[PDB]
Design a protein around this ligand. Structure first.
Ligand SMILES: NC(=O)c1ccc[n+]([C@@H]2O[C@H](COP(=O)([O-])OP(=O)(O)OC[C@H]3O[C@@H](n4cnc5c(N)ncnc54)[C@H](OP(=O)(O)O)[C@@H]3O)[C@@H](O)[C@H]2O)c1
Ligand SMILES: COc1cc(Cc2cnc(N)nc2N)cc(/C=C/C(=O)N2N=Cc3ccccc3[C@@H]2c2cc(C)cc(C)c2)c1OC
Length: 162
């Protein structure tokens, strides 16, 4: 399976100055539970923002840098390399990789951050006419998680005659 994994706000903001605009620990635990034991594919800028690979999963970084080499990170240099990765592959970001892959993935795990943040990077527009809501689960709010959010699992709809 090839999946998108993303958090975006009410206006599809995903980042500001190479950081998540929001502080929401519950969504990082969501990311952890979905992607442990599988593969994350991310662009170079997204990797440098995190700074080190996330433990207990394959970390794949897409870059044009022939010199790129980080311990615990596998490097690919073209989009076509993604389809050769085994197992469940999650497209992890950022805007550039999302734009290149949104028309190719089987499904999307989207955390909708129910707010309006200042951003400089965005998830591409998409329509629920094209995507079936396999599940929609409201995140629970508490002391450390104060922004309403919704976990969506969207599966691409099949085009059928009538
Ligand atoms: N909210 C979320 O769920 C989420 C998730 C991830 C990231 N983000 C945010 O997204 C922002 C970064 O997005 P971004 O688009 O600016 O950067 P990005 O997609 O993370 O990285 C872009 C880089 O990836 C490499 N790349 C992309 N496509 C390629 C291709 N076809 N072939 C070879 N290399 C390729 C290039 O690296 P080189 O220039 O080294 O060749 C390119 O400069 C950050 O603010 C981050 O916080 C948000
Ligand atoms: C730009 O910056 C980033 C972007 C994204 C992309 C992304 C965010 N959300 C959605 N929904 N989709 C997305 N593709 C992720 C991250 C997160 C990286 C991070 O440190 N952990 N993540 C998972 C993890 C797994 C195992 C051990 C440690 C972690 C760690 C973490 C886990 C837990 C349980 C709590 C905390 C506080 C951290 C990121 O760094 C801020």
């Amino acid at each position: 399976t090839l999946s998108i994994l993303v958090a975006h706000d009410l206006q599809r903001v995903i980042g500001f100055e190479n950081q998540l605009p929001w502080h929401l620990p519950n969504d990082l635990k969501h990311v952890k539970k979905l992607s442990t034991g599988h593969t994350l594919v991310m662009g170079r800028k997204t990797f440098e923002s995190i700074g080190k690979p996330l433990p207990n999963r394959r970390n794949v970084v897409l870059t044009s840098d022939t010199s790129f080499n980080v311990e615990g990170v596998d490097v690919i240099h073209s989009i076509e390399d993604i389809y050769q990765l085994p197992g469940h592959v999650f497209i992890f970001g950022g805007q550039t990789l999302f734009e290149e892959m949104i028309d190719k993935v089987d499904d999307m795990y989207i955390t909708v951050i129910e707010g309006k943040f200042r951003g400089d990077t965005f998830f591409p527009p998409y329509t629920f006419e094209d995507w079936e809501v396999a599940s929609s689960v409201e995140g629970k709010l508490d002391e450390k998680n104060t922004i309403p959010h919704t976990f969506l699992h969207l599966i691409r709809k099949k085009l059928v005659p009538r």
